[PDB]
Coordinates of C-alpha atoms and ligand atoms in Angstrom, one line a residue:
Chain A
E1 CA 76.1 163.8 208.9
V2 CA 72.4 163.0 209.5
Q3 CA 71.6 160.1 211.8
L4 CA 68.5 158.5 213.3
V5 CA 69.0 155.8 215.9
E6 CA 66.1 153.6 217.1
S7 CA 66.4 151.8 220.4
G8 CA 64.2 150.2 223.1
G9 CA 63.1 147.1 221.1
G10 CA 63.0 143.6 222.5
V11 CA 60.5 140.8 223.3
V12 CA 57.3 141.4 225.2
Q13 CA 54.2 139.4 226.2
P14 CA 50.7 140.1 224.6
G15 CA 48.8 142.7 226.5
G16 CA 52.0 144.2 227.7
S17 CA 53.7 147.5 226.8
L18 CA 56.9 148.8 225.3
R19 CA 58.4 152.3 224.8
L20 CA 60.6 153.0 221.8
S21 CA 62.8 156.0 221.2
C22 CA 64.8 157.5 218.4
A23 CA 67.8 159.7 218.9
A24 CA 68.2 162.4 216.2
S25 CA 71.4 164.3 215.2
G26 CA 72.9 166.1 212.2
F27 CA 69.8 168.2 211.5
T28 CA 67.6 170.7 213.3
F29 CA 65.2 168.1 214.6
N30 CA 63.0 170.6 216.3
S31 CA 62.1 172.1 212.9
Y32 CA 60.7 169.0 211.4
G33 CA 57.7 166.8 212.0
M34 CA 58.4 163.1 212.5
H35 CA 56.9 159.8 211.5
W36 CA 56.9 156.2 212.7
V37 CA 56.7 153.4 210.2
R38 CA 56.6 149.7 210.8
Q39 CA 57.3 146.6 208.7
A40 CA 56.3 143.2 209.7
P41 CA 58.5 140.3 208.5
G42 CA 57.4 139.3 204.9
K43 CA 55.2 142.4 204.7
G44 CA 55.3 145.9 203.2
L45 CA 55.6 149.3 204.9
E46 CA 52.9 150.5 207.2
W47 CA 52.5 154.0 208.5
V48 CA 52.0 154.2 212.2
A49 CA 52.0 157.8 213.6
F50 CA 53.0 161.4 213.0
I51 CA 53.8 164.3 215.3
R52 CA 54.3 168.0 214.3
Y53 CA 57.4 170.1 215.0
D54 CA 56.0 171.7 218.1
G55 CA 55.0 168.5 219.7
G56 CA 51.3 169.6 219.5
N57 CA 49.1 167.9 217.0
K58 CA 49.4 164.1 216.8
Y59 CA 48.0 161.7 214.2
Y60 CA 47.7 157.9 214.2
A61 CA 46.9 155.0 211.9
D62 CA 43.4 153.5 212.6
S63 CA 45.1 150.2 213.4
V64 CA 47.0 151.7 216.4
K65 CA 44.7 154.6 217.3
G66 CA 43.8 154.4 220.9
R67 CA 46.7 152.2 221.8
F68 CA 49.8 154.0 220.7
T69 CA 51.0 157.4 221.8
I70 CA 53.5 159.6 220.0
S71 CA 55.6 162.2 221.7
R72 CA 58.9 164.1 221.4
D73 CA 61.4 166.0 223.5
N74 CA 62.9 168.8 221.5
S75 CA 65.6 169.6 224.1
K76 CA 67.0 166.1 223.8
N77 CA 66.4 165.6 220.1
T78 CA 64.5 162.4 220.9
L79 CA 61.4 161.0 219.4
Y80 CA 59.3 158.5 221.4
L81 CA 56.6 155.9 220.7
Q82 CA 54.7 154.5 223.7
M83 CA 52.8 151.3 222.8
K84 CA 50.1 149.9 225.1
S85 CA 48.0 146.7 224.8
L86 CA 50.4 145.1 222.3
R87 CA 49.2 142.2 220.2
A88 CA 50.9 139.5 218.2
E89 CA 50.0 141.3 215.0
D90 CA 52.2 144.2 216.2
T91 CA 55.4 142.3 215.6
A92 CA 57.4 144.4 213.2
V93 CA 60.6 146.4 212.6
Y94 CA 59.9 150.0 213.8
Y95 CA 61.5 152.9 212.0
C96 CA 61.6 156.6 212.8
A97 CA 61.6 158.7 209.7
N98 CA 61.5 162.2 208.3
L99 CA 59.4 161.6 205.2
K100 CA 59.5 164.1 202.3
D101 CA 56.2 165.8 202.4
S102 CA 55.1 169.0 200.6
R103 CA 51.7 169.1 202.2
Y104 CA 52.1 168.7 206.0
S105 CA 55.6 168.5 207.5
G106 CA 57.2 170.6 204.8
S107 CA 60.3 168.3 204.8
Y108 CA 62.4 168.7 201.7
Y109 CA 64.7 165.8 202.7
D110 CA 64.0 162.1 203.3
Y111 CA 65.7 160.5 206.3
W112 CA 65.3 157.0 207.9
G113 CA 66.7 155.3 210.9
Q114 CA 68.1 151.7 211.2
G115 CA 65.0 150.0 212.6
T116 CA 64.4 148.3 215.9
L117 CA 62.6 145.0 216.2
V118 CA 59.6 144.5 218.4
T119 CA 58.4 141.0 219.1
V120 CA 55.1 140.3 220.8
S121 CA 54.7 136.6 222.0
Chain B
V1 CA 41.2 156.8 204.7
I2 CA 42.7 156.5 201.1
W3 CA 43.4 153.0 199.8
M4 CA 46.5 152.3 197.8
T5 CA 47.1 149.3 195.4
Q6 CA 49.9 148.3 193.1
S7 CA 50.1 146.1 190.0
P8 CA 51.7 143.7 189.2
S9 CA 52.5 142.5 192.7
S10 CA 55.7 141.0 191.2
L11 CA 57.5 141.1 187.9
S12 CA 60.7 139.6 186.4
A13 CA 62.9 141.4 183.9
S14 CA 66.4 141.2 182.5
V15 CA 69.1 143.9 182.2
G16 CA 68.2 146.6 179.7
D17 CA 64.5 145.8 179.9
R18 CA 61.9 148.5 180.5
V19 CA 60.0 148.0 183.8
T20 CA 56.7 149.7 184.5
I21 CA 54.9 149.6 187.9
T22 CA 51.3 150.9 188.3
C23 CA 50.0 152.6 191.5
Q24 CA 46.4 153.4 192.0
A25 CA 44.6 155.4 194.7
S26 CA 41.0 154.8 195.8
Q27 CA 40.6 158.6 195.9
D28 CA 41.9 161.6 193.8
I29 CA 45.3 162.5 195.4
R30 CA 46.3 165.0 192.7
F31 CA 50.1 164.9 192.4
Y32 CA 51.0 164.0 196.1
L33 CA 52.7 160.6 195.6
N34 CA 56.1 159.3 196.7
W35 CA 58.0 156.3 195.3
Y36 CA 60.4 154.3 197.5
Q37 CA 62.9 151.6 196.7
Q38 CA 63.7 149.0 199.4
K39 CA 66.3 146.4 199.4
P40 CA 66.4 143.5 202.0
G41 CA 67.8 144.6 205.4
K42 CA 67.7 148.3 204.6
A43 CA 65.4 151.2 205.1
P44 CA 63.4 152.5 202.1
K45 CA 65.1 155.1 199.8
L46 CA 63.0 157.9 198.2
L47 CA 63.4 158.1 194.4
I48 CA 60.5 160.2 193.3
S49 CA 58.4 162.9 195.1
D50 CA 55.3 164.8 194.0
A51 CA 54.5 162.2 191.4
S52 CA 57.3 163.1 189.0
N53 CA 60.1 165.0 190.7
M54 CA 63.4 163.1 190.8
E55 CA 65.4 163.1 194.0
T56 CA 69.0 164.4 193.9
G57 CA 71.4 161.5 193.2
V58 CA 68.8 159.3 191.5
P59 CA 69.9 157.9 188.1
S60 CA 68.3 159.4 185.0
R61 CA 67.0 156.0 184.0
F62 CA 64.3 156.4 186.7
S63 CA 61.1 158.3 185.9
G64 CA 57.5 158.6 186.8
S65 CA 54.2 160.4 186.0
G66 CA 50.5 160.5 186.6
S67 CA 47.8 162.5 188.3
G68 CA 44.6 161.9 190.2
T69 CA 44.1 158.2 190.8
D70 CA 46.4 156.5 188.3
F71 CA 50.2 156.8 188.6
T72 CA 53.1 155.1 186.8
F73 CA 56.7 154.3 187.8
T74 CA 59.2 153.5 185.1
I75 CA 62.7 152.2 184.7
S76 CA 63.9 152.9 181.2
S77 CA 66.8 150.4 181.3
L78 CA 66.8 148.0 184.2
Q79 CA 70.2 147.5 185.9
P80 CA 71.3 144.5 188.1
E81 CA 71.4 146.9 191.0
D82 CA 67.7 147.9 190.5
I83 CA 66.5 144.6 192.0
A84 CA 64.3 145.8 194.9
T85 CA 60.8 146.2 196.2
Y86 CA 59.1 149.4 195.1
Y87 CA 56.4 151.2 197.1
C88 CA 54.1 154.1 196.4
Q89 CA 52.9 156.3 199.2
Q90 CA 50.3 159.0 199.4
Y91 CA 50.6 162.2 201.5
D92 CA 47.5 164.0 200.2
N93 CA 45.9 163.6 203.6
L94 CA 46.4 161.9 207.0
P95 CA 46.7 159.1 207.8
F96 CA 49.4 158.4 205.2
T97 CA 49.4 155.1 203.4
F98 CA 51.8 152.8 201.5
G99 CA 50.9 150.5 198.7
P100 CA 51.3 146.6 198.9
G101 CA 54.7 146.9 197.3
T102 CA 55.9 145.6 193.9
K103 CA 58.9 143.2 193.8
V104 CA 61.1 143.4 190.8
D105 CA 63.1 140.2 190.4
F106 CA 65.8 139.1 188.0
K107 CA 64.8 137.2 184.8
Chain C
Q1 CA 70.0 178.6 182.4
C2 CA 70.2 176.8 185.7
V3 CA 73.6 175.7 187.0
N4 CA 74.7 173.3 189.7
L5 CA 76.0 175.2 192.7
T6 CA 75.2 172.7 195.5
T7 CA 77.9 170.3 194.5
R8 CA 79.1 169.8 198.1
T9 CA 77.6 167.8 200.9
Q10 CA 75.3 169.3 203.5
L11 CA 77.0 171.0 206.4
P12 CA 75.9 170.4 210.0
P13 CA 73.7 173.0 211.8
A14 CA 74.8 175.6 214.4
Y15 CA 72.6 177.2 217.0
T16 CA 72.3 180.5 218.7
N17 CA 70.2 182.0 221.5
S18 CA 67.1 184.0 220.5
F19 CA 67.0 185.8 223.8
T20 CA 64.0 188.1 223.8
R21 CA 63.9 188.9 220.1
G22 CA 61.3 188.1 217.4
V23 CA 58.4 190.0 219.0
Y24 CA 56.2 191.9 216.6
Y25 CA 53.2 194.2 217.0
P26 CA 50.3 191.7 217.1
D27 CA 47.8 194.1 215.5
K28 CA 47.2 197.6 214.1
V29 CA 45.8 199.0 217.3
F30 CA 47.1 201.9 219.3
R31 CA 47.7 201.3 223.0
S32 CA 49.7 203.2 225.5
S33 CA 50.9 203.0 229.1
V34 CA 49.3 199.5 229.4
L35 CA 50.2 195.9 229.8
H36 CA 48.3 193.9 227.2
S37 CA 48.0 190.1 227.2
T38 CA 47.8 188.6 223.7
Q39 CA 47.7 185.1 222.2
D40 CA 49.4 184.8 218.8
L41 CA 52.3 183.1 217.0
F42 CA 55.5 184.3 218.6
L43 CA 59.1 183.2 218.7
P44 CA 59.7 181.5 222.1
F45 CA 62.1 183.3 224.4
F46 CA 65.6 181.8 224.9
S47 CA 65.0 179.2 222.2
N48 CA 67.6 177.6 219.8
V49 CA 67.7 179.5 216.5
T50 CA 69.4 177.7 213.6
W51 CA 72.4 179.5 212.2
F52 CA 73.0 178.8 208.6
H53 CA 76.1 179.5 206.5
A54 CA 74.8 179.5 203.0
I55 CA 78.1 180.5 201.6
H56 CA 81.1 179.3 203.7
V57 CA 84.7 180.5 203.1
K58 CA 83.6 178.5 198.2
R59 CA 81.1 176.1 199.8
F60 CA 77.6 176.7 198.6
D61 CA 74.9 175.1 200.7
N62 CA 71.5 176.9 200.7
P63 CA 68.8 174.3 201.8
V64 CA 65.1 174.4 201.4
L65 CA 63.5 174.7 204.8
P66 CA 60.0 174.0 206.3
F67 CA 57.7 177.0 206.9
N68 CA 55.6 175.3 209.6
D69 CA 53.4 178.0 211.2
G70 CA 55.6 181.0 210.5
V71 CA 59.2 181.9 210.3
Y72 CA 61.6 184.2 212.1
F73 CA 64.4 185.3 209.8
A74 CA 67.4 187.4 210.6
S75 CA 70.7 188.3 208.9
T76 CA 73.7 190.6 209.5
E77 CA 75.6 191.7 206.3
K78 CA 76.8 194.7 204.4
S79 CA 77.4 192.9 201.2
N80 CA 73.8 192.8 200.0
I81 CA 74.0 189.1 199.2
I82 CA 70.6 188.1 200.5
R83 CA 68.0 189.5 198.2
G84 CA 64.8 187.6 198.7
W85 CA 62.8 184.5 199.4
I86 CA 60.8 181.8 197.8
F87 CA 57.7 180.4 199.5
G88 CA 55.5 177.6 198.4
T89 CA 54.8 173.8 198.5
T90 CA 56.1 171.8 195.6
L91 CA 58.2 174.7 194.4
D92 CA 57.6 173.8 190.8
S93 CA 55.3 174.4 187.8
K94 CA 52.5 172.4 189.4
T95 CA 51.5 174.9 192.0
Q96 CA 51.4 178.6 192.8
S97 CA 54.5 180.0 194.4
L98 CA 55.5 183.3 196.0
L99 CA 58.6 185.0 194.8
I100 CA 60.0 188.0 196.7
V101 CA 63.0 189.7 195.2
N102 CA 64.7 193.0 196.3
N103 CA 67.0 195.1 194.1
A104 CA 68.6 198.5 194.0
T105 CA 65.4 200.6 193.6
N106 CA 62.4 198.4 194.3
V107 CA 60.9 195.1 195.6
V108 CA 59.0 192.9 193.3
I109 CA 56.6 190.3 194.6
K110 CA 55.0 187.8 192.2
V111 CA 52.8 184.8 192.6
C112 CA 52.9 182.4 189.6
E113 CA 53.5 178.8 188.6
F114 CA 57.2 179.1 188.7
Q115 CA 59.5 176.3 187.6
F116 CA 62.4 176.9 189.9
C117 CA 66.0 175.8 189.5
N118 CA 67.4 173.0 191.8
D119 CA 69.4 175.6 193.7
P120 CA 68.1 179.0 192.5
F121 CA 70.0 182.3 192.7
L122 CA 69.9 185.8 191.4
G123 CA 72.4 186.5 188.6
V124 CA 74.3 189.8 188.8
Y125 CA 76.5 191.0 185.9
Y126 CA 78.8 193.9 185.4
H127 CA 79.4 195.5 182.0
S128 CA 76.5 199.5 184.2
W129 CA 74.9 196.5 186.1
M130 CA 72.5 193.9 184.8
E131 CA 70.3 191.6 186.8
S132 CA 68.4 188.5 185.8
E133 CA 65.8 186.3 187.5
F134 CA 66.2 183.5 184.9
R135 CA 68.8 182.1 187.3
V136 CA 66.0 181.6 189.8
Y137 CA 63.4 180.1 187.5
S138 CA 63.3 178.8 183.9
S139 CA 59.8 179.9 183.3
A140 CA 56.6 181.1 185.0
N141 CA 52.9 181.2 183.9
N142 CA 49.3 181.7 185.3
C143 CA 50.3 184.7 187.5
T144 CA 47.6 185.6 190.0
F145 CA 49.3 188.3 192.0
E146 CA 51.8 191.1 191.5
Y147 CA 53.0 193.9 193.9
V148 CA 55.8 196.5 193.6
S149 CA 57.0 198.8 196.2
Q150 CA 60.2 200.1 197.9
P151 CA 63.0 197.8 199.0
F152 CA 62.5 195.7 202.1
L153 CA 66.2 195.3 202.8
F154 CA 79.2 198.6 212.7
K155 CA 76.8 196.2 210.8
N156 CA 73.1 196.3 210.0
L157 CA 70.9 193.6 211.5
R158 CA 67.8 192.9 209.5
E159 CA 64.9 191.0 211.1
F160 CA 61.7 189.6 209.5
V161 CA 58.7 187.6 210.5
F162 CA 56.7 185.7 207.9
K163 CA 53.1 184.5 208.5
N164 CA 50.5 183.0 206.2
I165 CA 47.0 183.1 207.8
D166 CA 43.6 182.9 206.1
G167 CA 45.2 183.7 202.7
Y168 CA 47.2 186.7 203.9
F169 CA 50.9 186.6 203.8
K170 CA 52.0 189.0 206.5
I171 CA 55.5 190.5 206.7
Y172 CA 56.9 192.3 209.8
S173 CA 60.4 193.8 209.8
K174 CA 62.9 195.8 211.8
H175 CA 66.3 197.3 211.0
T176 CA 68.8 198.0 213.8
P177 CA 72.6 198.6 214.2
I178 CA 74.8 195.9 215.7
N179 CA 78.4 195.7 217.0
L180 CA 78.4 192.0 217.7
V181 CA 79.4 189.0 215.6
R182 CA 78.4 185.3 215.4
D183 CA 75.3 185.8 217.5
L184 CA 72.1 187.7 218.1
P185 CA 72.1 190.8 220.4
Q186 CA 70.4 191.1 223.8
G187 CA 67.6 193.6 224.5
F188 CA 64.1 194.2 223.3
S189 CA 62.9 195.5 219.9
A190 CA 59.5 195.0 218.4
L191 CA 59.0 194.4 214.7
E192 CA 56.6 196.8 212.9
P193 CA 54.2 195.5 210.2
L194 CA 55.5 195.9 206.6
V195 CA 52.8 194.6 204.2
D196 CA 49.7 192.4 204.1
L197 CA 49.5 190.5 200.8
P198 CA 46.1 189.0 199.8
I199 CA 47.6 186.1 198.0
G200 CA 45.5 183.0 198.9
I201 CA 48.0 180.2 198.5
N202 CA 49.4 177.4 200.7
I203 CA 53.0 177.7 202.0
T204 CA 54.8 174.7 203.6
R205 CA 58.4 175.3 202.5
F206 CA 60.7 178.2 201.7
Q207 CA 64.2 179.1 200.4
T208 CA 66.5 182.1 200.7
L209 CA 67.7 183.7 197.4
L210 CA 71.3 184.9 197.3
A211 CA 72.9 187.1 194.6
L212 CA 76.0 185.8 192.9
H213 CA 78.3 187.7 190.6
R214 CA 79.4 186.6 187.2
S215 CA 83.1 186.8 187.9
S216 CA 79.2 177.0 184.3
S217 CA 78.5 177.0 188.1
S218 CA 82.3 177.7 188.6
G219 CA 81.8 181.1 187.1
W220 CA 79.5 182.3 189.9
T221 CA 81.1 183.8 193.0
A222 CA 80.0 185.6 196.1
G223 CA 81.3 186.4 199.5
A224 CA 80.4 184.7 202.7
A225 CA 76.7 184.8 203.7
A226 CA 74.8 183.6 206.7
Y227 CA 71.4 183.9 208.3
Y228 CA 69.3 182.8 211.3
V229 CA 66.0 180.9 211.2
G230 CA 63.5 180.3 214.0
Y231 CA 59.9 179.1 214.1
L232 CA 56.8 180.6 215.7
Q233 CA 54.6 178.9 218.2
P234 CA 51.1 179.5 219.7
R235 CA 52.3 181.4 222.8
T236 CA 50.8 183.9 225.3
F237 CA 52.7 187.2 225.7
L238 CA 52.4 190.1 228.1
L239 CA 53.4 193.2 226.1
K240 CA 54.3 196.5 227.7
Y241 CA 53.4 199.6 225.8
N242 CA 54.9 202.9 226.8
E243 CA 53.3 206.3 226.6
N244 CA 54.0 206.6 222.8
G245 CA 52.5 203.1 222.0
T246 CA 55.9 201.5 221.5
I247 CA 56.4 198.1 223.0
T248 CA 59.4 198.4 225.3
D249 CA 59.2 195.0 227.0
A250 CA 57.5 191.6 226.9
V251 CA 57.0 188.4 228.9
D252 CA 56.8 184.9 227.5
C253 CA 54.2 183.4 229.9
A254 CA 55.5 179.8 229.4
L255 CA 59.2 180.6 229.9
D256 CA 59.1 179.9 233.6
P257 CA 57.0 180.1 236.9
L258 CA 58.1 183.7 237.4
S259 CA 56.8 184.7 233.9
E260 CA 53.6 182.8 234.6
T261 CA 53.1 184.9 237.8
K262 CA 53.7 188.1 235.9
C263 CA 51.2 187.2 233.2
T264 CA 48.6 186.2 235.8
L265 CA 49.0 189.4 237.8
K266 CA 49.6 191.6 234.7
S267 CA 52.7 193.2 236.2
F268 CA 56.5 193.4 235.4
Ligands
LIG301 C1 45.7 174.1 201.4 O1 45.7 173.2 202.5 C2 44.3 172.9 202.9 C3 44.4 172.0 204.1 O2 44.9 170.7 203.8 C4 43.5 172.2 201.7 O3 42.2 172.0 202.1 C5 41.7 170.6 201.8 O4 41.2 170.5 200.5 C6 40.7 169.2 200.1 C7 40.4 169.2 198.6 O5 39.3 170.1 198.4 C8 39.5 168.8 201.0 O6 39.1 167.5 200.6 C9 37.6 167.4 200.3 O7 36.8 167.6 201.5 C10 35.4 167.6 201.2 C11 34.6 167.9 202.5 O8 34.8 169.2 202.9 C12 35.0 166.3 200.6 O9 33.6 166.3 200.2 C13 35.8 166.0 199.3 O10 35.5 164.8 198.7 C14 37.3 166.0 199.7 O11 37.6 165.0 200.5 C15 40.0 168.8 202.5 O12 38.9 168.5 203.3 C16 40.5 170.3 202.8 N1 41.0 170.3 204.2 C17 40.5 171.2 205.1 C18 41.1 171.2 206.5 O13 39.7 172.0 204.7 C19 43.5 173.2 200.5 O14 42.9 172.6 199.4 C20 45.0 173.5 200.1 N2 45.0 174.4 199.0 C21 45.5 174.1 197.8 C22 45.5 175.0 196.7 O15 45.9 172.9 197.6
LIG302 C1 64.5 196.6 190.0 O1 63.2 196.2 190.0 C2 62.3 197.2 189.3 C3 60.9 196.7 189.4 O2 60.6 195.6 188.6 C4 62.8 197.3 187.8 O3 62.0 198.4 187.2 C5 61.1 197.9 186.1 O4 61.9 197.7 184.9 C6 61.1 197.2 183.8 C7 62.1 196.9 182.6 O5 62.7 198.1 182.2 C8 60.0 198.2 183.4 O6 59.2 197.7 182.3 C9 59.1 198.4 184.6 O7 58.1 199.3 184.3 C10 60.0 198.9 185.8 N1 59.2 199.1 187.0 C11 59.4 200.0 187.9 C12 58.6 200.2 189.1 O8 60.4 200.8 187.7 C13 64.2 197.8 187.8 O9 64.7 197.9 186.4 C14 65.1 196.7 188.6 N2 66.5 197.1 188.6 C15 67.4 196.5 187.8 C16 68.8 196.9 187.9 O10 67.0 195.6 187.1
NAG303 C1 73.5 170.3 186.3 O1 73.4 168.9 186.5 C2 72.5 168.2 185.6 C3 72.5 166.7 186.0 O2 71.8 166.5 187.3 C4 72.9 168.4 184.2 O3 72.0 167.7 183.3 C5 73.0 169.9 183.8 O4 73.4 170.1 182.5 C6 73.9 170.6 184.8 N1 73.9 172.0 184.6 C7 74.9 172.6 183.9 C8 74.9 174.1 183.6 O5 75.9 171.9 183.5
NAG304 C1 69.3 174.8 223.2 O1 70.4 173.9 222.9 C2 71.3 173.5 224.0 C3 72.4 172.6 223.5 O2 73.3 173.3 222.6 C4 70.4 172.8 225.1 O3 71.3 172.5 226.2 C5 69.3 173.8 225.5 O4 68.5 173.1 226.6 C6 68.4 174.1 224.3 N1 67.4 175.0 224.7 C7 66.1 174.9 224.3 C8 65.0 175.9 224.7 O5 65.8 174.0 223.5
NAG305 C1 45.5 179.3 187.3 O1 45.4 179.0 188.7 C2 44.0 178.9 189.1 C3 44.0 178.6 190.6 O2 44.6 177.3 190.9 C4 43.3 177.7 188.3 O3 41.9 177.6 188.7 C5 43.4 178.0 186.8 O4 42.7 177.0 186.1 C6 44.8 178.1 186.4 N1 44.9 178.5 185.0 C7 45.7 177.8 184.2 C8 45.8 178.2 182.7 O5 46.3 176.8 184.6
NAG306 C1 57.5 209.9 223.6 O1 57.5 210.9 222.6 C2 57.9 212.2 223.0 C3 57.8 213.2 221.8 O2 56.4 213.5 221.7 C4 59.4 212.1 223.4 O3 59.9 213.4 223.9 C5 59.6 211.1 224.5 O4 60.9 210.9 224.9 C6 59.0 209.7 224.0 N1 59.1 208.7 225.1 C7 59.4 207.4 224.9 C8 59.4 206.5 226.0 O5 59.6 207.1 223.7

């Protein structure tokens, strides 16, 4: 029933920008916080950003802080990630996820999308 | 920011072997650690939450334990379908972090 | 002994309109014939409230939900299937958890290191009647808080608001008649304060406890059960107090430009 679908990937130049989105369905999206996680080819998982259920408080990894912006539209069940000043090092598969978390988001279930590839070159 | 490391970075084992993976935090994260299993081309699957709680649907051969800085993930009887890269992740505080990832290969 | 009730897959969500419900008295202060502007955690007007069918008609699906910054809970039943709630974080023996259970004569509230079942429920037997909490948890230790009082719980519509601020778990509630089905009624009704519990624990997740009758998991049956869950947000409200200090109306200042104007001018 639960689906998360990333889109908006593609190939961009260094110093450019790209806006990703994730369409959520099958669960009450507006009740959960959401995360972005990226995985560069040949590398492990890297946490990127987190936004609370109300779209208020936002948190970022130090490596993207000041460049990336996280947002959500709860009337469209869509999660967004706006990336500015992209670098070659940002090449990765980007996932939207609902990570099980007993401390912050309160999620009791773990959901992941399919992953959208972003290439910077 | 809390640092996460895992050891060994890679191990090989045969079917029926016991496999242990160590995850260590640079700071005391109590019992707030997740374990994920990722196979090539797929998103990570959660197996264990809160250090030792098993997710519904996860085979009883999987287990884990630990508290503070030193945590262990164990497979009591490795199956041919357990060949994957395992990650530990802390959610004691933001930003959240994942470990390097431990690859379990087939002997 | 814990049994496996949730043997079916998870059902998709349904939603209803909150209209103008979920407003509670923000404090214990008497005001009258006055429009008072207050900033607190309130349920947004005309928002989408999730409608759960924990027991669908014998499909048992009673999920653990996030608590966020507070929860609006409502139900309409005459079967007395909903008995209580569990609030906590890990919901296991590692942390303190809050267990609120209602029965025929009282309400019992305990905070202990409960080791809860995967899909906990209250066991009801008929011989005289017998009731057991060991279908909710296997064991509990290191209890820090205990409170006992009178029961918290056409058709009767029961509404609750749960907050957890600065160590205090605050419960508000209202009981009204309803002649509608499959939705929430229109109109305004403020929720009066019920109890302030000096507990001092973290709450991030919660679950609703249902009573099942012994008449292993296949031996437990109950009639259909459903409830509504919404979440509170930091909102500014203009509350209208009548001459007796009862709130008769309210404006959600962020609902629209018209409401913003009313809140600015302090007028309905
Ligand atoms: C309930 O949730 C709150 C909020 O997350 C928890 O508060 C946090 O507790 C940790 C552990 O004590 C604090 O970390 C420590 O901070 C001090 C500096 O104040 C530092 O010297 C220590 O080395 C350590 O990093 C954390 O800062 C604190 N967060 C906030 C916002 O105060 C609280 O512990 C939770 N309650 C329970 C029972 O878990
Ligand atoms: C409903 O809850 C009340 C409160 O826990 C139960 O009353 C208690 O019963 C125990 C066991 O006999 C006594 O030791 C307590 O002193 C009683 N407390 C109070 C306030 O009466 C009551 O038995 C429960 N009802 C049923 C059917 O179990
Ligand atoms: C519930 O399922 C578990 C397996 O996940 C099993 O070990 C347990 O015995 C079952 N409970 C009952 C009453 O059969
Ligand atoms: C509530 O959900 C409906 C879809 O069923 C949507 O059209 C409407 O805009 C939503 N309202 C709010 C406040 O989210
Ligand atoms: C009971 O809980 C308190 C608060 O967390 C803790 O300090 C105390 O050590 C616990 N007692 C036992 C026996 O676990
Ligand atoms: C206020 O209380 C009086 C009784 O003292 C009652 O007659 C009157 O109808 C009440 N008015 C409202 C608006 O509740």
